[PDB]
PDB file of C-alpha atoms and ligand atoms in Angstrom:
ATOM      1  CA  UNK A   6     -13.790 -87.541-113.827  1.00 18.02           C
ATOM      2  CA  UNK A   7     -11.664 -89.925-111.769  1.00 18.26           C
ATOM      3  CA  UNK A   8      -7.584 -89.424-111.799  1.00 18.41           C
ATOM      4  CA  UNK A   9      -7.264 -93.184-112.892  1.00 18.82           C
ATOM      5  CA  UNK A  10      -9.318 -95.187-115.452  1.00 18.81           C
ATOM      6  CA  UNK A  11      -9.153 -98.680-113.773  1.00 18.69           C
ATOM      7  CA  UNK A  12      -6.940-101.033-110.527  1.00 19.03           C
ATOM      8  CA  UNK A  13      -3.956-101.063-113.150  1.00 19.08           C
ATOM      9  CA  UNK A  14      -2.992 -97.383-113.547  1.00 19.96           C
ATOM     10  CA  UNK A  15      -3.693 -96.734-109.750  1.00 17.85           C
ATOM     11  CA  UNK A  16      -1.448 -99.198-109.238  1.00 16.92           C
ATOM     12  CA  UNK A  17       1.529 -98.129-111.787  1.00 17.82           C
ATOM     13  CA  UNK A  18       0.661 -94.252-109.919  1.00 20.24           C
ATOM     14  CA  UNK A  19       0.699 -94.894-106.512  1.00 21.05           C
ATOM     15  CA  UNK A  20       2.772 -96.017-103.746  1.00 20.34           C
ATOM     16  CA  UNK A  21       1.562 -99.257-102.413  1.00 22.35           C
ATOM     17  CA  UNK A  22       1.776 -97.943 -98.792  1.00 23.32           C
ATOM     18  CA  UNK A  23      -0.600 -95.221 -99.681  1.00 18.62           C
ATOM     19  CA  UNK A  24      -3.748 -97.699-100.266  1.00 17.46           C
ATOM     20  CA  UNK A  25      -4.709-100.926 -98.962  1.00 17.71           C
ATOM     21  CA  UNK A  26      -6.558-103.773-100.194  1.00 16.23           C
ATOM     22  CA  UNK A  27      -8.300-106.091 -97.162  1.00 18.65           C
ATOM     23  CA  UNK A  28     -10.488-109.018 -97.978  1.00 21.23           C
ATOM     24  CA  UNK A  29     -12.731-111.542 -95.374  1.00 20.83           C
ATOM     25  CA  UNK A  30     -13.892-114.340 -97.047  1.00 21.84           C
ATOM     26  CA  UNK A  31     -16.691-116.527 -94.871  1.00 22.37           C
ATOM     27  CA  UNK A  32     -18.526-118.656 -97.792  1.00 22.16           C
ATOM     28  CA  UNK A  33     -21.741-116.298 -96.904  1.00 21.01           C
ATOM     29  CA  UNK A  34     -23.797-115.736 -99.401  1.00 21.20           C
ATOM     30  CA  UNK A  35     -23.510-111.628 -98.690  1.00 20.84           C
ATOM     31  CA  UNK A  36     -20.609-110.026 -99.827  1.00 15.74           C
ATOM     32  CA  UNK A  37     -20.107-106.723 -98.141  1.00 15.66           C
ATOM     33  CA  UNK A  38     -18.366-104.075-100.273  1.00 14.95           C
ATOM     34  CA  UNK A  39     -16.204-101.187 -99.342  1.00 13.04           C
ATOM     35  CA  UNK A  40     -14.627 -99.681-102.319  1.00 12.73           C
ATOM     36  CA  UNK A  41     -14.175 -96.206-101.506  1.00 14.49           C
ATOM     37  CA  UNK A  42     -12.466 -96.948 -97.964  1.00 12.80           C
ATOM     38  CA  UNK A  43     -10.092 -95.114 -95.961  1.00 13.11           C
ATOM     39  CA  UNK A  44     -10.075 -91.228 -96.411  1.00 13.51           C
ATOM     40  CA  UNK A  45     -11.627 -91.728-100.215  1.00 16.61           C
ATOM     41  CA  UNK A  46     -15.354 -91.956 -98.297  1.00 16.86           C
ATOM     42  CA  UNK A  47     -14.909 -91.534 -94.710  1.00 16.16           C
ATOM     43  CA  UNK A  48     -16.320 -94.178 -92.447  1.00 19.30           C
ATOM     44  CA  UNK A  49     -17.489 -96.843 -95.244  1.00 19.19           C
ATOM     45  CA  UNK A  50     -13.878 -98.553 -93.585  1.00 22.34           C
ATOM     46  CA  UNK A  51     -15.774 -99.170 -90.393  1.00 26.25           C
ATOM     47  CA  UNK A  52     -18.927 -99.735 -91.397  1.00 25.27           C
ATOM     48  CA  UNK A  53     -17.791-102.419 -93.394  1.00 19.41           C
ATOM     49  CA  UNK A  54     -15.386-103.981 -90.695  1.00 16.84           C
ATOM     50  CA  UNK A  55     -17.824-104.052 -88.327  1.00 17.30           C
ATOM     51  CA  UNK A  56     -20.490-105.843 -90.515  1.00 18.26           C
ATOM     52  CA  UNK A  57     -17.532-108.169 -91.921  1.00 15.85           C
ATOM     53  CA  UNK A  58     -18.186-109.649 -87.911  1.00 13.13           C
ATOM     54  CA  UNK A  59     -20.664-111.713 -89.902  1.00 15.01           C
ATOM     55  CA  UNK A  60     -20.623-111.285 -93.834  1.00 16.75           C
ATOM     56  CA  UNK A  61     -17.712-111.841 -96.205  1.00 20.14           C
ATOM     57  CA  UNK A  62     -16.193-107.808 -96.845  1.00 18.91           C
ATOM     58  CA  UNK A  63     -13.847-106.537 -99.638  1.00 18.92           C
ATOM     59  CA  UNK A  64     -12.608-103.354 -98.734  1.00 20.33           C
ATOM     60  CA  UNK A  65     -10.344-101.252-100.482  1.00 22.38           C
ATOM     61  CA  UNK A  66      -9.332 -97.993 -98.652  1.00 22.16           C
ATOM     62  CA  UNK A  67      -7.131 -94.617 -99.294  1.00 21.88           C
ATOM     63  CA  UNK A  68      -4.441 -94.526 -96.646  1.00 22.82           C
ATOM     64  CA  UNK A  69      -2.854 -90.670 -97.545  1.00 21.24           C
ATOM     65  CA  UNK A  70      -3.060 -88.325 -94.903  1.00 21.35           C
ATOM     66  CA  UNK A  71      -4.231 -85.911 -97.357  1.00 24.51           C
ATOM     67  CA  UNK A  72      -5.405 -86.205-101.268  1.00 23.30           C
ATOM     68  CA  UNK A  73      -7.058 -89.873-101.366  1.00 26.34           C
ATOM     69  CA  UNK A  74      -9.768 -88.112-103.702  1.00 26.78           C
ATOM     70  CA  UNK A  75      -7.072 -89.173-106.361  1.00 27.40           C
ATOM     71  CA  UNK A  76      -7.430 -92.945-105.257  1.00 31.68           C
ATOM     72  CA  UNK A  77     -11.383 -92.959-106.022  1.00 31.60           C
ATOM     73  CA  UNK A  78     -12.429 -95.484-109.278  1.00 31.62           C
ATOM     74  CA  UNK A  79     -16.256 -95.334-109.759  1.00 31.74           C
ATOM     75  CA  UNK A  80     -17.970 -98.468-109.273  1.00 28.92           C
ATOM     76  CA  UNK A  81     -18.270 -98.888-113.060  1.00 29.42           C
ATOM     77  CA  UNK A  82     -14.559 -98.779-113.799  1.00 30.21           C
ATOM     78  CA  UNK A  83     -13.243-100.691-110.370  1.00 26.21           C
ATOM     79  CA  UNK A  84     -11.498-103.539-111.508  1.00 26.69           C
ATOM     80  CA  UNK A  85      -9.023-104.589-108.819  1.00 25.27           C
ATOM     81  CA  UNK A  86      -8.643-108.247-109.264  1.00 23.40           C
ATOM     82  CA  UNK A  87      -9.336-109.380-105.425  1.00 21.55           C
ATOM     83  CA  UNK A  88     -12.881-107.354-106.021  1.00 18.48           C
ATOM     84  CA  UNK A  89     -13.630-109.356-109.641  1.00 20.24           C
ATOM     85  CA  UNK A  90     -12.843-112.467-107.575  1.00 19.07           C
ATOM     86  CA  UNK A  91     -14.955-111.929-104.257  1.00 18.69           C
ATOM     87  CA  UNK A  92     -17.874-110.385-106.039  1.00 16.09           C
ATOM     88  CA  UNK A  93     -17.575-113.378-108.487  1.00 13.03           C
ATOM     89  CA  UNK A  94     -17.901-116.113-105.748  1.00 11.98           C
ATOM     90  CA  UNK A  95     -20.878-114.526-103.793  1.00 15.66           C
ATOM     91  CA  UNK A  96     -24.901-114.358-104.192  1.00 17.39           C
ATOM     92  CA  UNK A  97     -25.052-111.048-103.689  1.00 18.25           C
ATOM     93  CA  UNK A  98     -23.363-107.894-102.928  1.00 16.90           C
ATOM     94  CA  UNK A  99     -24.087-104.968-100.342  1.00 16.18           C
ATOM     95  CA  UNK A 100     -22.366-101.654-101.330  1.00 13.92           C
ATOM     96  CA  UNK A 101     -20.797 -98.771 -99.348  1.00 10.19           C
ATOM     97  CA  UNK A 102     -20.780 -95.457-100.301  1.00  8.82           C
ATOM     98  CA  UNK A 103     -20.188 -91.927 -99.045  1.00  8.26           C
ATOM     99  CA  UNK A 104     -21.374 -88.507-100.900  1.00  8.55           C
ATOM    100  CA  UNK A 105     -20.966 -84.766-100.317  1.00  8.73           C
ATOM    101  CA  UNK A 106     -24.144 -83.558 -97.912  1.00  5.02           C
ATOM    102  CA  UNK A 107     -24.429 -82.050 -94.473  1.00  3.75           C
ATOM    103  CA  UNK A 108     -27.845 -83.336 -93.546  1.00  5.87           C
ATOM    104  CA  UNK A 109     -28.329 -86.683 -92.467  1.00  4.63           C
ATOM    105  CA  UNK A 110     -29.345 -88.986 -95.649  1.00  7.25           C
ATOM    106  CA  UNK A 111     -29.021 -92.617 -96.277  1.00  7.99           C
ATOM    107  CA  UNK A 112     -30.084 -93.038-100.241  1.00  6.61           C
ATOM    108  CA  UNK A 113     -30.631 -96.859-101.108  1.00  6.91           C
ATOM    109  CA  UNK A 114     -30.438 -97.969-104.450  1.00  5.31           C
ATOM    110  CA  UNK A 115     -29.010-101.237-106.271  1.00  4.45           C
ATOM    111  CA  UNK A 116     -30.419-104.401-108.718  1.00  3.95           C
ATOM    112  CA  UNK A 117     -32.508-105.910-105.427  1.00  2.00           C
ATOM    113  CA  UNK A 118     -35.426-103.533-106.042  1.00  4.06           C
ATOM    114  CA  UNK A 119     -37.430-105.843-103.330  1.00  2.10           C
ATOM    115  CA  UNK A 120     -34.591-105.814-100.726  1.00  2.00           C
ATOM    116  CA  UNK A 121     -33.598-102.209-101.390  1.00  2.00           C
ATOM    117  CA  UNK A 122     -37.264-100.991-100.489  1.00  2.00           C
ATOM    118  CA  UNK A 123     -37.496-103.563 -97.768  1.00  2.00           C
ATOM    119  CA  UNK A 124     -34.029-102.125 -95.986  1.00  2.00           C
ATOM    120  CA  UNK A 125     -34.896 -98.696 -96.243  1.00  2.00           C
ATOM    121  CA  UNK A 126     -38.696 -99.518 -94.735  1.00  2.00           C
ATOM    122  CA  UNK A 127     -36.663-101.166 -91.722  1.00  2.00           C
ATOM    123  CA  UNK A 128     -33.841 -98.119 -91.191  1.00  2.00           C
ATOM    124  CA  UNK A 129     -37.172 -95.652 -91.555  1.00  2.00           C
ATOM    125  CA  UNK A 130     -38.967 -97.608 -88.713  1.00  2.00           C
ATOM    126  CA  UNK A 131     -35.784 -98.011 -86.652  1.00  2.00           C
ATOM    127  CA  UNK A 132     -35.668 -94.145 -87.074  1.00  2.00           C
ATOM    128  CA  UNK A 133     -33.187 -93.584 -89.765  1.00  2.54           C
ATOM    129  CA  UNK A 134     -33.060 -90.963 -92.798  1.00  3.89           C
ATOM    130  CA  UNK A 135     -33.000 -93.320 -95.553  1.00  6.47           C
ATOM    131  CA  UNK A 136     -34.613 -92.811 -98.696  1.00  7.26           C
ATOM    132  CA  UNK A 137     -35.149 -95.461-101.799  1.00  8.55           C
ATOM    133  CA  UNK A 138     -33.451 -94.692-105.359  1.00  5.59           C
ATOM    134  CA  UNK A 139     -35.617 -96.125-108.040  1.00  3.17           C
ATOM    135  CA  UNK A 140     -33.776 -97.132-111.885  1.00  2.00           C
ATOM    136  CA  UNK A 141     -33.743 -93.704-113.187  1.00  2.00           C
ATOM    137  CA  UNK A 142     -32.084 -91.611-110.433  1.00  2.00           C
ATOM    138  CA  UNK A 143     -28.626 -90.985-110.772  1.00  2.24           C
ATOM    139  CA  UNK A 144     -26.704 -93.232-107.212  1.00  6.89           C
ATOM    140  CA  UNK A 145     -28.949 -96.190-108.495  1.00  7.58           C
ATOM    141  CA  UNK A 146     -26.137 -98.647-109.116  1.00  5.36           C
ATOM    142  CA  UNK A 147     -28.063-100.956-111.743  1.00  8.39           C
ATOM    143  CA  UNK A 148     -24.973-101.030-114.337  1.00  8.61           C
ATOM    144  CA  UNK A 149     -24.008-104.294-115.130  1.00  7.84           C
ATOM    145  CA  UNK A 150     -20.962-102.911-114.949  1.00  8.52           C
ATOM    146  CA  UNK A 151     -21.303-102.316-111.483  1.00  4.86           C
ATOM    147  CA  UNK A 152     -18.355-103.967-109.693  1.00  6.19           C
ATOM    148  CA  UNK A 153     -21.286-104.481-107.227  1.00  7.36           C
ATOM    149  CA  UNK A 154     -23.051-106.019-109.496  1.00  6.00           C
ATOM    150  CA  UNK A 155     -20.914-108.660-110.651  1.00  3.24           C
ATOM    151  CA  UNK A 156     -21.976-111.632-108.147  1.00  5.05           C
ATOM    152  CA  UNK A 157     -23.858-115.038-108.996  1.00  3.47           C
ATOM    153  CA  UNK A 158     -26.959-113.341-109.140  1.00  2.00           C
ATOM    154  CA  UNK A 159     -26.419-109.985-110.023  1.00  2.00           C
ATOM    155  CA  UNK A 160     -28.827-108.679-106.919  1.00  2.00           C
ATOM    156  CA  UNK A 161     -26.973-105.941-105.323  1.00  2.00           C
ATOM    157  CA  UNK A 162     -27.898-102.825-102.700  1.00  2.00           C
ATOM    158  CA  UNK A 163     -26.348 -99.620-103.196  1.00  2.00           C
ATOM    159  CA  UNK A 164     -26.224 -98.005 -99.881  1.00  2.00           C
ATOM    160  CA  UNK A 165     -25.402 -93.961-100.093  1.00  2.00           C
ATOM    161  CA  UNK A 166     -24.522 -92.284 -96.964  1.00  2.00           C
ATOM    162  CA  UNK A 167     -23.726 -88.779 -96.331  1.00  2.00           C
ATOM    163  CA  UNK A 168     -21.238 -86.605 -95.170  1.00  2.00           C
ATOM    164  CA  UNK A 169     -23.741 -85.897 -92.148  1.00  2.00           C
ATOM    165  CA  UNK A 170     -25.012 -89.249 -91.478  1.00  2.00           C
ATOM    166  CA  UNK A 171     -21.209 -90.619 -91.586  1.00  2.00           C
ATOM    167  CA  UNK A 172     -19.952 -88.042 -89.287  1.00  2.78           C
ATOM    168  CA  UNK A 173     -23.062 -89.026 -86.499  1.00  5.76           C
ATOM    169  CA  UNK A 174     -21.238 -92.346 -85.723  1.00  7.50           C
ATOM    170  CA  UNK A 175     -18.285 -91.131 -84.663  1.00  8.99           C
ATOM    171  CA  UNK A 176     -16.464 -89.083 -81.918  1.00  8.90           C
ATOM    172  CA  UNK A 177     -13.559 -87.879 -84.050  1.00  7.47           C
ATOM    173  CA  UNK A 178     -13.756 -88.654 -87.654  1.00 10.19           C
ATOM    174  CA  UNK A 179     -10.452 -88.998 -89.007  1.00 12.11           C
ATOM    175  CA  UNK A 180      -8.580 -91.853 -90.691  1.00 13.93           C
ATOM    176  CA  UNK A 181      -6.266 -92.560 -87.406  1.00 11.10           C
ATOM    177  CA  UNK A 182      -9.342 -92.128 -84.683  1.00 11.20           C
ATOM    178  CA  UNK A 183     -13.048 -93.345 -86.398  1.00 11.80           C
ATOM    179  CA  UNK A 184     -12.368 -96.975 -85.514  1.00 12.96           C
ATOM    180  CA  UNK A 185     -11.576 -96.035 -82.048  1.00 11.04           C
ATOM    181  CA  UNK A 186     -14.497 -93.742 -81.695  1.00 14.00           C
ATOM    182  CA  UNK A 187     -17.674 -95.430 -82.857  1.00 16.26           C
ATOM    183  CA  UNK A 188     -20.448 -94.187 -81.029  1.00 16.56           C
ATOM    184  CA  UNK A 189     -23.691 -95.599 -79.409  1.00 17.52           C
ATOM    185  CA  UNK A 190     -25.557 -94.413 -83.110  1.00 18.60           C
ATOM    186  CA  UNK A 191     -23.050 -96.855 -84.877  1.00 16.38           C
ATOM    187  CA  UNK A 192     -24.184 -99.498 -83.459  1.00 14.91           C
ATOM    188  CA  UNK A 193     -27.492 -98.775 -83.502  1.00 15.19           C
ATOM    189  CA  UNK A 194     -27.268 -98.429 -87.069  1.00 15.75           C
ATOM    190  CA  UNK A 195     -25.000-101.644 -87.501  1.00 11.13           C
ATOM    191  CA  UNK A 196     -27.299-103.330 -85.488  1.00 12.65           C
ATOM    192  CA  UNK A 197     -30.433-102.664 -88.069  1.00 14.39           C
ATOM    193  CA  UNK A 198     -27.947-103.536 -90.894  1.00 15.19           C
ATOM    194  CA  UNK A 199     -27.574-107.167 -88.686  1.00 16.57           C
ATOM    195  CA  UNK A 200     -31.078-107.585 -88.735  1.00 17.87           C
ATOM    196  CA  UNK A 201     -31.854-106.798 -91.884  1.00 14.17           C
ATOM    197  CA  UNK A 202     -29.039-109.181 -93.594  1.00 14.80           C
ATOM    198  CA  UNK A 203     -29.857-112.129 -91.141  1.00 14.14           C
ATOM    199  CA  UNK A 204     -33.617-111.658 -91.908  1.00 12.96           C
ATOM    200  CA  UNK A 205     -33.578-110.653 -95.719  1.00 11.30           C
ATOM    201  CA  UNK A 206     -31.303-112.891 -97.466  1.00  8.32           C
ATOM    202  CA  UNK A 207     -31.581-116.794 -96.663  1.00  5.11           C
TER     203      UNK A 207
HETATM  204  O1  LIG B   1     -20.615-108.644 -82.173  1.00  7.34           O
HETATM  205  C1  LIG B   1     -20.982-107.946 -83.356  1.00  7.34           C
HETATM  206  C2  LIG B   1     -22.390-108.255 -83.776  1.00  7.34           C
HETATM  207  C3  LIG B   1     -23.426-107.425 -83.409  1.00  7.34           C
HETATM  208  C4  LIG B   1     -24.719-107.705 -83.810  1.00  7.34           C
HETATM  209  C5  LIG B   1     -24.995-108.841 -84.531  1.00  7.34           C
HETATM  210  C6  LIG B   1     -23.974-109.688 -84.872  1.00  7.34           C
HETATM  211  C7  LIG B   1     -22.674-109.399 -84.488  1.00  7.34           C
END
């Protein structure tokens, strides 16, 4: 159970310097998606900003030093009206997402069955721990409620990382130092995201 039901009552609760919305808008057809930023989901901030390099990003990202837990809305009840808008003018929509687990794990789920079996077939061959989430598991991300899910299409991949995997790609991983500490396993893994989103959606 989340401390706030939707954007509005986060909002009305919190201090404005303790969260931050951040938006790049390229006319791609990708839209990537960050909505547990910051220190809600450590490191789903920097992936994102480094894929937003090529794709369209909406980020939205805890800024406490402690406590951003209480800033997390579940994809389902994430409202915030630059997200409606940006997921609203795109094709399709990749996801970000961090969850509690020391091994290394990347679960892939989303609408896109065929992309979301095709990316985790790529990140397996380039030597990544992914793993595809079919309708019925629990991270699959098909509600059309989805904030990822509400695009032209409605095609979206869920992308799940752990606590392990995230903590791999960089030297010191804390809100002040990730972005300053990406590692060579970052962009290895950014890279394979590159290739995937040049190759997969055209
Ligand atoms: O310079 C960042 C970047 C890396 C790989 C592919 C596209 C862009």
């Amino acid at each position: 159970e989340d401390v706030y039901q939707n954007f509005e009552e986060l909002k009305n609760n919190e201090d404005p310097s303790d969260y931050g919305v951040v938006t790049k808008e390229t006319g791609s057809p990708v839209l990537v998606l960050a909505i547990h930023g910051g220190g809600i989901e450590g490191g789903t901030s920097e992936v994102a900003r480094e894929l937003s390099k090529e794709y369209s990003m909406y980020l939205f990202e805890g800024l406490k030093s402690a406590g951003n837990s209480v800033l997390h809305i579940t994809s389902t009840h994430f409202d915030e009206p630059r997200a409606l808008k940006m997921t609203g003018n795109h094709e399709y929509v990749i996801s970000l997402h961090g969850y509690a687990e020391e091994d290394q794990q990347i679960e892939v789920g989303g609408t896109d069955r065929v992309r979301a079996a095709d990316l985790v077939e790529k990140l397996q061959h380039a030597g990544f721990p992914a793993v595809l989430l079919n309708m019925d598991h629990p991270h699959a991300g098909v509600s059309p409620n989805n904030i990822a899910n509400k695009s032209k299409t409605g095609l979206s991949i869920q992308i799940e990382m752990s606590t392990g995997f995230r903590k791999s790609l960089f030297g010191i991983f804390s809100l002040k130092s990730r972005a300053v500490t990406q590692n060579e396993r970052f962009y290895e893994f950014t890279e394979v995201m590159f290739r995937f989103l040049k190759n997969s959606y055209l």
